[PDB]
Amino acid sequence: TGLLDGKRILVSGIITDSSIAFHIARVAQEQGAQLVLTGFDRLRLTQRITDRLPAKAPLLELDVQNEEHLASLAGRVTEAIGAGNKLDGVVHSIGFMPQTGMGINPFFDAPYADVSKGIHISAYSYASMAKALLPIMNPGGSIVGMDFDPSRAMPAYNWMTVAKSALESVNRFVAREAGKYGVRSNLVAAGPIRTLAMSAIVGGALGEEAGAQIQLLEEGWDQRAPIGWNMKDATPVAKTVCALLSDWLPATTGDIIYADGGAHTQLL
Amino acid sequence: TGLLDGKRILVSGIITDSSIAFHIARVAQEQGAQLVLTGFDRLRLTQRITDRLPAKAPLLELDVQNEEHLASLAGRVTEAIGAGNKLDGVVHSIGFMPQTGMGINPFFDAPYADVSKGIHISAYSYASMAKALLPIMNPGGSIVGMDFDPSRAMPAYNWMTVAKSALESVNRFVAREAGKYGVRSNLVAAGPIRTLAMSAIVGGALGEEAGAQIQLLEEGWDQRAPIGWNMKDATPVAKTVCALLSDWLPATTGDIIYADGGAHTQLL
Amino acid sequence: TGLLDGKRILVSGIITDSSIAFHIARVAQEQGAQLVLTGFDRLRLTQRITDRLPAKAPLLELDVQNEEHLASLAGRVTEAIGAGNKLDGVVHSIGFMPQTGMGINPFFDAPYADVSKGIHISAYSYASMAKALLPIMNPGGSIVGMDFDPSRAMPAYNWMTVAKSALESVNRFVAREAGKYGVRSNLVAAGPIRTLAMSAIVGGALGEEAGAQIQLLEEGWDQRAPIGWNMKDATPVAKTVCALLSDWLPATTGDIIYADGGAHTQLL
Amino acid sequence: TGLLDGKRILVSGIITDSSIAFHIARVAQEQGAQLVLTGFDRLRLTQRITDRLPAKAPLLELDVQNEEHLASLAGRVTEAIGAGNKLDGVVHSIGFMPQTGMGINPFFDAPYADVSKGIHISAYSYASMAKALLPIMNPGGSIVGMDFDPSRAMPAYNWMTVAKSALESVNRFVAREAGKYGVRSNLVAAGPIRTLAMSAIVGGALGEEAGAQIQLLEEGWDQRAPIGWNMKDATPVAKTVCALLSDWLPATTGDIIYADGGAHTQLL
Ligand SMILES: NC(=O)C1=CN([C@@H]2O[C@H](COP(=O)(O)OP(=O)(O)OC[C@H]3O[C@@H](n4cnc5c(N)ncnc54)[C@H](O)[C@@H]3O)[C@@H](O)[C@H]2O)C=CC1
Ligand SMILES: NC(=O)C1=CN([C@@H]2O[C@H](COP(=O)(O)OP(=O)(O)OC[C@H]3O[C@@H](n4cnc5c(N)ncnc54)[C@H](O)[C@@H]3O)[C@@H](O)[C@H]2O)C=CC1
Ligand SMILES: NC(=O)C1=CN([C@@H]2O[C@H](COP(=O)(O)OP(=O)(O)OC[C@H]3O[C@@H](n4cnc5c(N)ncnc54)[C@H](O)[C@@H]3O)[C@@H](O)[C@H]2O)C=CC1
Ligand SMILES: NC(=O)C1=CN([C@@H]2O[C@H](COP(=O)(O)OP(=O)(O)OC[C@H]3O[C@@H](n4cnc5c(N)ncnc54)[C@H](O)[C@@H]3O)[C@@H](O)[C@H]2O)C=CC1
């Protein structure tokens, strides 16, 4: 009806109702989009969470590390949206880093296997999602991934920040490939969102000093955001993703939109 | 009706029908916005150009270097939109650099007075427009200025690039001030647009080697843009500005949106 | 004898013994360089300060806003270093912004004349120094200016940050011109140094809230500097400038070296 | 005797005499440094290459993917430099990406195992080298890794660019850890160097179009370098690394020094 009217959009990464992807999906639906959802390891839970969406959406299984899931993904989406229909939009809202790559675990002590797994899911999967789905995307389409500005190092995020640096770089290459399809690829760099995991880390699940650091990070973020930053509100990020999913940023690709309150533009 | 429905938006910088601001204004109107226009030194011409807009819009005089124009500006806009109404949107699409600051004139030979004038109109005026208009802007409002990525030096643009670097920096401070009003401030970094002036420089008005360089710049831009770059089409930039004028990028301020085909994200 | 042995280097910007340029000059002398100094409005004071340098150095008057000073500068330097001798090194350590462009004076209230003056001295003069001196610089030479990272807005520095953004951009163009002479042009982005002016602003000369903000800026800087930041020690910055003046960064030009403790690479 | 007099420096990554690390090692020796070298899979060859160095240097085996090599590394270096002696300097000049991650092999077709291996050797190993060696580094020490600016995507370099983005990010975290030891960590972003591998790719070993693209990349680099770029001369990069290994950039860490001719600062 409005922003995304008629668009067909795959949204990955809903796991709980505080998933950023939950709000992206909600807002996209409110904006006229038709969704296909993907979920990874807790499918029954995703479905039960997604029941709360403004509209029903087919849910497909996708373990971004499973090569068969990816191989079959486009066929499954075509099944879900019907033959001869294509996606206009793909949202990657997927990220993971083993606990060793994060928080109080010393940066040097994260074993490569762990880091590799995190980079697989958090960075490489952006490309492999774009590989699976570009064949079934319309000209004018839009792939959006979720980013957390890794331009500068920060406490606790450790190897996830490295993963995000890799993602940003993947995104620029995906844009090169997507452009052949008339498709844009972009990242939304969000401010900290109080996701279940984030609340758990502030509460110390990855060590006390990590939790204290991330709490300071959050406070500093809202302080230097010229328009403030509400970490309990994923809506301004969901809207931003929708902005990129829409026809309203048609000359932007390979790029990063910062939905962070303007915090990254301010030193103090 | 759509993107900018109900919004009231001042658009500066229409001088010809190939002004970027012409397309911004056209698109904003198509998207439901109500406009107040400003024009500088050729008011009769601006009016005659703007007659072609989808809707009529009050045109106000604003010479960004005239302190009285700025002092009176908000009152004049309030007159134009009616008492008790405010602006939701301000577009700065203003830039100028004396010929000595550009093209074949050696970078070192631009006299400071010339450079100063260019920086006044091209950079400082962004702040002084925000000063004049923030008192008459609604919470949730949006100031947008036009940028040309000055991260790296380039032939011919010389002191205008310096002016743009200054603008980017002004924009981050304006965001600090705007945030007090619940207002975002952002720049759109556009790709090269074949504006009358740009066509004139490609044709050699600022020297042959400058024209040859800018023609190469343009070709290179479209080449590395993963989705291409059409310098004859200001529409993708107008849409981008509208995107920023809208409620769809609500967490972005002090920032730069690149409507350049993705060209800045690619080396070759 | 060591780093700068045999090099002839103009150093501007010594005004007190806590001038960054004082330490640059001291270190360059310790490293074998032969200096010509320039001073602006307090020549007797500069001379008396410079008497403390490890070696005597001719002092020349240069008001970067005085076109005759600039016109005569190279002849005066040639007089000072002797006919047929050239400079290997130029240090721009010059900056000024009227009080209205800074601190507690609202960013919007700085009159353009004031801002223009600040940008003249702080940014444009880098080019006009390079114009005066490149004709008398040797292949392999090095121009270095002093920068304060203006990538993000910050309290109190207001229009000086804008000035620094303009400088960074000027530096990239100066590099284009300098390269014709076989000369590098680069900026050193220093951390906050407790210069007389800086101490005065921390003490509130530009308003209490500005002083409080700059004190917080300083503390935050040392906190996120992975190797710390000592604002009372200009030596690590002087060394960095010498590094750039030397043959040891021969492939770096148009660029910015950050002598800030690594602070800019860290978010928190 | 000069720049690195008395310093003890581990240099990894010599494999042929056109290895960047060969020139780093040569220059460091010329500058007074005492070296320990490491070599990976062709030890007899490294030794035979290193015989040509100005001075003899113990060569140690280090397969950055071998956890036992890393576990033993510091003991082996202490053996080589003698008990109670420490390193002042560590050079990481290590990089690898399987052919599938590069050139004409479509970016989407690089299998994760391949990419992971490349990121292991090219990015993660920078951290794991810093882990092995920081316990045996002196305050004031310097770790330097080799970077190729991955800020923008480019043809052919594909997943190696992603690897370099990951490296840059690793470097910022390593700086955090190194600072505890009084140690700096920095990257040198070099211009293209005609290394054996690079010559082989220009000659088409990774596909014709890749070779054509990299040849264009190289030409463009020298064109926009304000001081030119000689891809056949690794010396300006070796000097830059030495600059970072020295006491002359003491306030720089977590950072990237661009030894690229200034090319990255120029658009065209
Ligand atoms: N929460 C925050 O503060 C910020 C998060 N982000 C990013 O937003 C994106 C979404 O995460 P959030 O909503 O915060 O957390 P979340 O935990 O709600 O979402 C992460 C999603 O990744 C999915 N996932 C993990 N491994 C997978 C695999 N092998 N295959 C398929 N899917 C897999 C999870 O199932 C989950 O649905 C992530 O990329 C995250 O890094 C970006 C900025 C800030
Ligand atoms: N044409 C291009 O390739 C690109 C242009 N831009 C920027 O877009 C903005 C709009 O310019 P264009 O549409 O290209 O050219 P234009 O010439 O159509 O618009 C420039 C406008 O600035 C106005 N102006 C000049 N001095 C003024 C003053 N003292 N007071 C008030 N207004 C004044 C002019 O009247 C004109 O309307 C400028 O900021 C320009 O630098 C940004 C990227 C690319
Ligand atoms: N103090 C700090 O924390 C930092 C300073 N910087 C920069 O370092 C450079 C040196 O300044 P500082 O040593 O801090 O202060 P300073 O006050 O000791 O040096 C500023 C110099 O600029 C000179 N100057 C001013 N107007 C002039 C004109 N019209 N012509 C010629 N010279 C003129 C002054 O005489 C003075 O010698 C400046 O560019 C400053 O912005 C950069 C980063 C940090
Ligand atoms: N050649 C170029 O144009 C540029 C190269 N660089 C970087 O310079 C660094 C040095 O490479 P180059 O001198 O060009 O090539 P090179 O092939 O001479 O050096 C690469 C080195 O990495 C070592 N290596 C590979 N796998 C290893 C492992 N598992 N364990 C230990 N060492 C291993 C190789 O043995 C070789 O010595 C690399 O990081 C490269 O990416 C950076 C910019 C430009």
JSON list of N, CA, C and O in Angstrom, two decimals, chain C residues 60-92:
[
{"chain": "C", "resi": 60, "resn": "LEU", "atom": "N", "xyz": [62.08, 34.38, 9.97]},
{"chain": "C", "resi": 60, "resn": "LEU", "atom": "CA", "xyz": [61.55, 35.23, 8.92]},
{"chain": "C", "resi": 60, "resn": "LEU", "atom": "C", "xyz": [60.15, 35.57, 9.28]},
{"chain": "C", "resi": 60, "resn": "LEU", "atom": "O", "xyz": [59.46, 34.79, 9.89]},
{"chain": "C", "resi": 61, "resn": "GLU", "atom": "N", "xyz": [59.69, 36.74, 8.89]},
{"chain": "C", "resi": 61, "resn": "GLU", "atom": "CA", "xyz": [58.32, 37.08, 9.19]},
{"chain": "C", "resi": 61, "resn": "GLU", "atom": "C", "xyz": [57.40, 36.51, 8.10]},
{"chain": "C", "resi": 61, "resn": "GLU", "atom": "O", "xyz": [57.67, 36.66, 6.88]},
{"chain": "C", "resi": 62, "resn": "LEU", "atom": "N", "xyz": [56.30, 35.88, 8.53]},
{"chain": "C", "resi": 62, "resn": "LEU", "atom": "CA", "xyz": [55.28, 35.40, 7.62]},
{"chain": "C", "resi": 62, "resn": "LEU", "atom": "C", "xyz": [53.90, 35.44, 8.25]},
{"chain": "C", "resi": 62, "resn": "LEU", "atom": "O", "xyz": [53.58, 34.67, 9.15]},
{"chain": "C", "resi": 63, "resn": "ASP", "atom": "N", "xyz": [53.13, 36.40, 7.79]},
{"chain": "C", "resi": 63, "resn": "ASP", "atom": "CA", "xyz": [51.74, 36.47, 8.09]},
{"chain": "C", "resi": 63, "resn": "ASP", "atom": "C", "xyz": [51.12, 35.85, 6.84]},
{"chain": "C", "resi": 63, "resn": "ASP", "atom": "O", "xyz": [51.02, 36.46, 5.78]},
{"chain": "C", "resi": 64, "resn": "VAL", "atom": "N", "xyz": [50.74, 34.61, 7.01]},
{"chain": "C", "resi": 64, "resn": "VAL", "atom": "CA", "xyz": [50.09, 33.80, 5.99]},
{"chain": "C", "resi": 64, "resn": "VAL", "atom": "C", "xyz": [48.90, 34.53, 5.30]},
{"chain": "C", "resi": 64, "resn": "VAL", "atom": "O", "xyz": [48.56, 34.23, 4.16]},
{"chain": "C", "resi": 65, "resn": "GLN", "atom": "N", "xyz": [48.34, 35.56, 5.94]},
{"chain": "C", "resi": 65, "resn": "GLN", "atom": "CA", "xyz": [47.32, 36.38, 5.26]},
{"chain": "C", "resi": 65, "resn": "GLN", "atom": "C", "xyz": [47.91, 37.56, 4.46]},
{"chain": "C", "resi": 65, "resn": "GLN", "atom": "O", "xyz": [47.19, 38.30, 3.78]},
{"chain": "C", "resi": 66, "resn": "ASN", "atom": "N", "xyz": [49.20, 37.78, 4.60]},
{"chain": "C", "resi": 66, "resn": "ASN", "atom": "CA", "xyz": [49.82, 38.88, 3.92]},
{"chain": "C", "resi": 66, "resn": "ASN", "atom": "C", "xyz": [50.39, 38.40, 2.58]},
{"chain": "C", "resi": 66, "resn": "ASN", "atom": "O", "xyz": [51.35, 37.63, 2.53]},
{"chain": "C", "resi": 67, "resn": "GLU", "atom": "N", "xyz": [49.77, 38.85, 1.49]},
{"chain": "C", "resi": 67, "resn": "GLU", "atom": "CA", "xyz": [50.18, 38.41, 0.15]},
{"chain": "C", "resi": 67, "resn": "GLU", "atom": "C", "xyz": [51.61, 38.83, -0.20]},
{"chain": "C", "resi": 67, "resn": "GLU", "atom": "O", "xyz": [52.31, 38.08, -0.88]},
{"chain": "C", "resi": 68, "resn": "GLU", "atom": "N", "xyz": [52.05, 40.01, 0.29]},
{"chain": "C", "resi": 68, "resn": "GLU", "atom": "CA", "xyz": [53.45, 40.44, 0.09]},
{"chain": "C", "resi": 68, "resn": "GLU", "atom": "C", "xyz": [54.44, 39.56, 0.86]},
{"chain": "C", "resi": 68, "resn": "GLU", "atom": "O", "xyz": [55.54, 39.26, 0.35]},
{"chain": "C", "resi": 69, "resn": "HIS", "atom": "N", "xyz": [54.08, 39.13, 2.07]},
{"chain": "C", "resi": 69, "resn": "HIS", "atom": "CA", "xyz": [54.96, 38.21, 2.83]},
{"chain": "C", "resi": 69, "resn": "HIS", "atom": "C", "xyz": [55.21, 36.92, 2.06]},
{"chain": "C", "resi": 69, "resn": "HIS", "atom": "O", "xyz": [56.30, 36.35, 2.09]},
{"chain": "C", "resi": 70, "resn": "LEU", "atom": "N", "xyz": [54.16, 36.44, 1.43]},
{"chain": "C", "resi": 70, "resn": "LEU", "atom": "CA", "xyz": [54.19, 35.20, 0.68]},
{"chain": "C", "resi": 70, "resn": "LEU", "atom": "C", "xyz": [54.95, 35.35, -0.63]},
{"chain": "C", "resi": 70, "resn": "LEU", "atom": "O", "xyz": [55.72, 34.46, -1.04]},
{"chain": "C", "resi": 71, "resn": "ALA", "atom": "N", "xyz": [54.72, 36.50, -1.26]},
{"chain": "C", "resi": 71, "resn": "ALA", "atom": "CA", "xyz": [55.38, 36.87, -2.51]},
{"chain": "C", "resi": 71, "resn": "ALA", "atom": "C", "xyz": [56.88, 36.94, -2.32]},
{"chain": "C", "resi": 71, "resn": "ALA", "atom": "O", "xyz": [57.65, 36.48, -3.17]},
{"chain": "C", "resi": 72, "resn": "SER", "atom": "N", "xyz": [57.30, 37.45, -1.17]},
{"chain": "C", "resi": 72, "resn": "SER", "atom": "CA", "xyz": [58.72, 37.63, -0.88]},
{"chain": "C", "resi": 72, "resn": "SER", "atom": "C", "xyz": [59.34, 36.42, -0.19]},
{"chain": "C", "resi": 72, "resn": "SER", "atom": "O", "xyz": [60.57, 36.32, -0.10]},
{"chain": "C", "resi": 73, "resn": "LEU", "atom": "N", "xyz": [58.51, 35.48, 0.26]},
{"chain": "C", "resi": 73, "resn": "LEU", "atom": "CA", "xyz": [58.97, 34.46, 1.20]},
{"chain": "C", "resi": 73, "resn": "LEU", "atom": "C", "xyz": [60.11, 33.66, 0.68]},
{"chain": "C", "resi": 73, "resn": "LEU", "atom": "O", "xyz": [61.10, 33.47, 1.37]},
{"chain": "C", "resi": 74, "resn": "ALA", "atom": "N", "xyz": [59.98, 33.15, -0.54]},
{"chain": "C", "resi": 74, "resn": "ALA", "atom": "CA", "xyz": [61.02, 32.26, -1.09]},
{"chain": "C", "resi": 74, "resn": "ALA", "atom": "C", "xyz": [62.38, 32.98, -1.24]},
{"chain": "C", "resi": 74, "resn": "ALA", "atom": "O", "xyz": [63.43, 32.40, -0.99]},
{"chain": "C", "resi": 75, "resn": "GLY", "atom": "N", "xyz": [62.34, 34.24, -1.66]},
{"chain": "C", "resi": 75, "resn": "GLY", "atom": "CA", "xyz": [63.57, 35.07, -1.79]},
{"chain": "C", "resi": 75, "resn": "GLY", "atom": "C", "xyz": [64.21, 35.22, -0.42]},
{"chain": "C", "resi": 75, "resn": "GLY", "atom": "O", "xyz": [65.39, 34.93, -0.25]},
{"chain": "C", "resi": 76, "resn": "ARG", "atom": "N", "xyz": [63.40, 35.59, 0.57]},
{"chain": "C", "resi": 76, "resn": "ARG", "atom": "CA", "xyz": [63.89, 35.68, 1.96]},
{"chain": "C", "resi": 76, "resn": "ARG", "atom": "C", "xyz": [64.48, 34.38, 2.49]},
{"chain": "C", "resi": 76, "resn": "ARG", "atom": "O", "xyz": [65.51, 34.42, 3.18]},
{"chain": "C", "resi": 77, "resn": "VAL", "atom": "N", "xyz": [63.86, 33.24, 2.15]},
{"chain": "C", "resi": 77, "resn": "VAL", "atom": "CA", "xyz": [64.40, 31.94, 2.57]},
{"chain": "C", "resi": 77, "resn": "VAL", "atom": "C", "xyz": [65.69, 31.66, 1.83]},
{"chain": "C", "resi": 77, "resn": "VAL", "atom": "O", "xyz": [66.61, 31.05, 2.38]},
{"chain": "C", "resi": 78, "resn": "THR", "atom": "N", "xyz": [65.74, 32.05, 0.56]},
{"chain": "C", "resi": 78, "resn": "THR", "atom": "CA", "xyz": [66.97, 31.78, -0.22]},
{"chain": "C", "resi": 78, "resn": "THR", "atom": "C", "xyz": [68.14, 32.63, 0.35]},
{"chain": "C", "resi": 78, "resn": "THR", "atom": "O", "xyz": [69.25, 32.15, 0.50]},
{"chain": "C", "resi": 79, "resn": "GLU", "atom": "N", "xyz": [67.83, 33.87, 0.70]},
{"chain": "C", "resi": 79, "resn": "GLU", "atom": "CA", "xyz": [68.75, 34.75, 1.42]},
{"chain": "C", "resi": 79, "resn": "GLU", "atom": "C", "xyz": [69.24, 34.04, 2.65]},
{"chain": "C", "resi": 79, "resn": "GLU", "atom": "O", "xyz": [70.45, 33.91, 2.83]},
{"chain": "C", "resi": 80, "resn": "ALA", "atom": "N", "xyz": [68.32, 33.48, 3.44]},
{"chain": "C", "resi": 80, "resn": "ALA", "atom": "CA", "xyz": [68.66, 32.82, 4.72]},
{"chain": "C", "resi": 80, "resn": "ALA", "atom": "C", "xyz": [69.45, 31.53, 4.60]},
{"chain": "C", "resi": 80, "resn": "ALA", "atom": "O", "xyz": [70.24, 31.20, 5.51]},
{"chain": "C", "resi": 81, "resn": "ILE", "atom": "N", "xyz": [69.23, 30.77, 3.53]},
{"chain": "C", "resi": 81, "resn": "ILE", "atom": "CA", "xyz": [69.92, 29.47, 3.35]},
{"chain": "C", "resi": 81, "resn": "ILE", "atom": "C", "xyz": [71.06, 29.56, 2.34]},
{"chain": "C", "resi": 81, "resn": "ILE", "atom": "O", "xyz": [71.83, 28.59, 2.16]},
{"chain": "C", "resi": 82, "resn": "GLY", "atom": "N", "xyz": [71.14, 30.72, 1.71]},
{"chain": "C", "resi": 82, "resn": "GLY", "atom": "CA", "xyz": [72.15, 30.98, 0.70]},
{"chain": "C", "resi": 82, "resn": "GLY", "atom": "C", "xyz": [71.72, 30.55, -0.69]},
{"chain": "C", "resi": 82, "resn": "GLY", "atom": "O", "xyz": [71.11, 29.49, -0.87]},
{"chain": "C", "resi": 83, "resn": "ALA", "atom": "N", "xyz": [72.06, 31.39, -1.67]},
{"chain": "C", "resi": 83, "resn": "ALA", "atom": "CA", "xyz": [71.78, 31.17, -3.09]},
{"chain": "C", "resi": 83, "resn": "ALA", "atom": "C", "xyz": [72.18, 29.77, -3.52]},
{"chain": "C", "resi": 83, "resn": "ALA", "atom": "O", "xyz": [73.18, 29.22, -3.04]},
{"chain": "C", "resi": 84, "resn": "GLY", "atom": "N", "xyz": [71.37, 29.17, -4.40]},
{"chain": "C", "resi": 84, "resn": "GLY", "atom": "CA", "xyz": [71.66, 27.83, -4.89]},
{"chain": "C", "resi": 84, "resn": "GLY", "atom": "C", "xyz": [71.37, 26.74, -3.86]},
{"chain": "C", "resi": 84, "resn": "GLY", "atom": "O", "xyz": [71.55, 25.55, -4.12]},
{"chain": "C", "resi": 85, "resn": "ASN", "atom": "N", "xyz": [70.93, 27.11, -2.67]},
{"chain": "C", "resi": 85, "resn": "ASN", "atom": "CA", "xyz": [70.42, 26.11, -1.74]},
{"chain": "C", "resi": 85, "resn": "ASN", "atom": "C", "xyz": [68.90, 26.07, -1.74]},
{"chain": "C", "resi": 85, "resn": "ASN", "atom": "O", "xyz": [68.24, 27.09, -1.89]},
{"chain": "C", "resi": 86, "resn": "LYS", "atom": "N", "xyz": [68.34, 24.88, -1.55]},
{"chain": "C", "resi": 86, "resn": "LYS", "atom": "CA", "xyz": [66.90, 24.76, -1.50]},
{"chain": "C", "resi": 86, "resn": "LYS", "atom": "C", "xyz": [66.47, 24.11, -0.18]},
{"chain": "C", "resi": 86, "resn": "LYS", "atom": "O", "xyz": [67.31, 23.51, 0.55]},
{"chain": "C", "resi": 87, "resn": "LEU", "atom": "N", "xyz": [65.17, 24.25, 0.11]},
{"chain": "C", "resi": 87, "resn": "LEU", "atom": "CA", "xyz": [64.51, 23.53, 1.20]},
{"chain": "C", "resi": 87, "resn": "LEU", "atom": "C", "xyz": [64.20, 22.11, 0.80]},
{"chain": "C", "resi": 87, "resn": "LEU", "atom": "O", "xyz": [63.84, 21.83, -0.34]},
{"chain": "C", "resi": 88, "resn": "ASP", "atom": "N", "xyz": [64.39, 21.22, 1.77]},
{"chain": "C", "resi": 88, "resn": "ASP", "atom": "CA", "xyz": [63.91, 19.88, 1.71]},
{"chain": "C", "resi": 88, "resn": "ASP", "atom": "C", "xyz": [62.58, 19.68, 2.44]},
{"chain": "C", "resi": 88, "resn": "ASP", "atom": "O", "xyz": [61.88, 18.68, 2.24]},
{"chain": "C", "resi": 89, "resn": "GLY", "atom": "N", "xyz": [62.23, 20.63, 3.30]},
{"chain": "C", "resi": 89, "resn": "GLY", "atom": "CA", "xyz": [61.17, 20.40, 4.23]},
{"chain": "C", "resi": 89, "resn": "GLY", "atom": "C", "xyz": [60.52, 21.71, 4.52]},
{"chain": "C", "resi": 89, "resn": "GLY", "atom": "O", "xyz": [61.20, 22.76, 4.59]},
{"chain": "C", "resi": 90, "resn": "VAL", "atom": "N", "xyz": [59.19, 21.63, 4.62]},
{"chain": "C", "resi": 90, "resn": "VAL", "atom": "CA", "xyz": [58.34, 22.72, 5.05]},
{"chain": "C", "resi": 90, "resn": "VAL", "atom": "C", "xyz": [57.32, 22.19, 6.07]},
{"chain": "C", "resi": 90, "resn": "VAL", "atom": "O", "xyz": [56.64, 21.17, 5.85]},
{"chain": "C", "resi": 91, "resn": "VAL", "atom": "N", "xyz": [57.26, 22.87, 7.21]},
{"chain": "C", "resi": 91, "resn": "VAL", "atom": "CA", "xyz": [56.30, 22.55, 8.23]},
{"chain": "C", "resi": 91, "resn": "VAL", "atom": "C", "xyz": [55.34, 23.74, 8.37]},
{"chain": "C", "resi": 91, "resn": "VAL", "atom": "O", "xyz": [55.74, 24.85, 8.68]},
{"chain": "C", "resi": 92, "resn": "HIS", "atom": "N", "xyz": [54.06, 23.45, 8.14]},
{"chain": "C", "resi": 92, "resn": "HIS", "atom": "CA", "xyz": [52.97, 24.34, 8.38]},
{"chain": "C", "resi": 92, "resn": "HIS", "atom": "C", "xyz": [52.42, 23.92, 9.77]},
{"chain": "C", "resi": 92, "resn": "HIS", "atom": "O", "xyz": [51.97, 22.80, 9.93]}
]
